[PDB]
Design a protein around this ligand. Structure first.
Ligand code: A1ITZ
Ligand code: A1ITZ
Ligand code: CA
Ligand code: CA
Lengths: 204, 204
């Protein structure tokens, strides 16, 4: 009975790990395809499964961080979202903190995604008329040539500036989608997806 | 691309079905062991996975109904819970409606669980001093000899009546646990649990 309950709890922990890996892969794919409602529903499922887990491997922690980063990016234009206990941190600033904390290579793509997040963290404030908040975001990020151009835009209140059209929200999203594409290749071999794919393939 | 996206969606639907079956089995077990917090957390996970599904087999629908019934039983003493759009229906009345709707055998255990739910649906109202609400519950359920005894208890306001001690909340719970024990034997062979058990067994 004591050994049996321990065996069941261990099996439930192995099953939860598989469900987490599956849901994290499904979330990345929904983000890549632009399936917004599927992303929202799958994020709810991932969060509930996490609250039912007590141990995470380093790989599962990295995976969770990537999903958290994608969640903040999707809500980048939702300034009413409070992702941190400090209520002044905007969603794109929260995504920037996680992007600089994930144990991943700092290749050219990493740095471009970082700089696109920094420019947009200011742009989304200006696009709503929150000019003082844009200055506060700027001071918290910067904490150049790139630095002084952005401060000049904030002071001039030039919301629809051509600089924000070159390094746009669409460009930031596309570069983040390219990264998600590499992640999706790595996780497409997780236990749950592989066994589900074999069942579908066997009925064709 | 069009065929590939269809294959992925089918595989995700097969994986979700496995996760639902696993979570429903885990919920029944937590209910049986009296692990209240695990029941609460696993119910949240089951609900989120259901909102991500669009097709359910008859077996999966029956399983969902059993979990819904267990959720109402656990909140039987929480009169502030509103499980139906009709705000007057108490949690035990909601459990009674589902128990009479599940496609299952109406054996001796089924009927005893039904009658224990009916007696307790009144008892939990009286135990809180809600004597008028107990009369309304009584009229919605009854809708005897059993019938006239209960009405006499409601009118006399005898909350701590010996009748409610013979057919008690503990007795209703134990009989429901015996039923859950039969369900647990049937579902202990689901795909996710079987493959998780084999991984744990292979490391001993
Ligand atoms: C997508 C990915 C992850 C989450 C999440 N919620 O809480 C947590 C815990 C912080 C340590 C794990 N992760 N929510 C959505
Ligand atoms: C445990 C079991 C099931 C549920 C649940 N929530 O919504 C539903 C839908 C009604 C048709 C399926 N089921 N919640 C907890
Ligand atoms: Ca705000
Ligand atoms: Ca009430």
């Amino acid at each position: 009975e004591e050994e049996d309950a321990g065996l069941v709890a261990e099996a439930e922990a192995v099953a939860a790990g598989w469900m987490l890996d599956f849901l994290c892969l499904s979330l990345c794919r929904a983000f890549r395809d632009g399936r917004s409602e599927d992303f929202r529903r799958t994020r709810n499922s991932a969060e509930a499964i996490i609250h039912g887990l007590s141990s995470l491997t380093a790989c599962q922690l990295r995976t969770i961080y990537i999903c958290q980063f994608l969640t903040r990016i999707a809500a980048g234009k939702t300034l009413d979202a409070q992702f941190e206990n400090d209520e002044r941190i905007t969603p794109l600033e929260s995504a920037l903190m996680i992007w600089g904390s994930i144990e991943k290579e700092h290749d050219k793509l990493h740095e471009e995604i970082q700089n696109l997040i920094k420019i947009q963290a200011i742009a989304v404030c200006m696009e709503n008329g929150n000019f003082k908040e844009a200055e506060e975001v700027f001071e918290r990020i910067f904490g150049m040539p790139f630095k002084s151009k952005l401060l000049m835009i904030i002071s001039q209140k030039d919301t629809f500036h051509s600089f924000f059209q070159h390094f746009s929200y669409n460009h930031m999203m596309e570069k983040i989608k390219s990264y998600v594409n590499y992640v999706l290749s790595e996780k497409s071999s997780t236990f749950l997806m592989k066994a589900a794919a074999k069942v579908v393939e066997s009925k064709r």
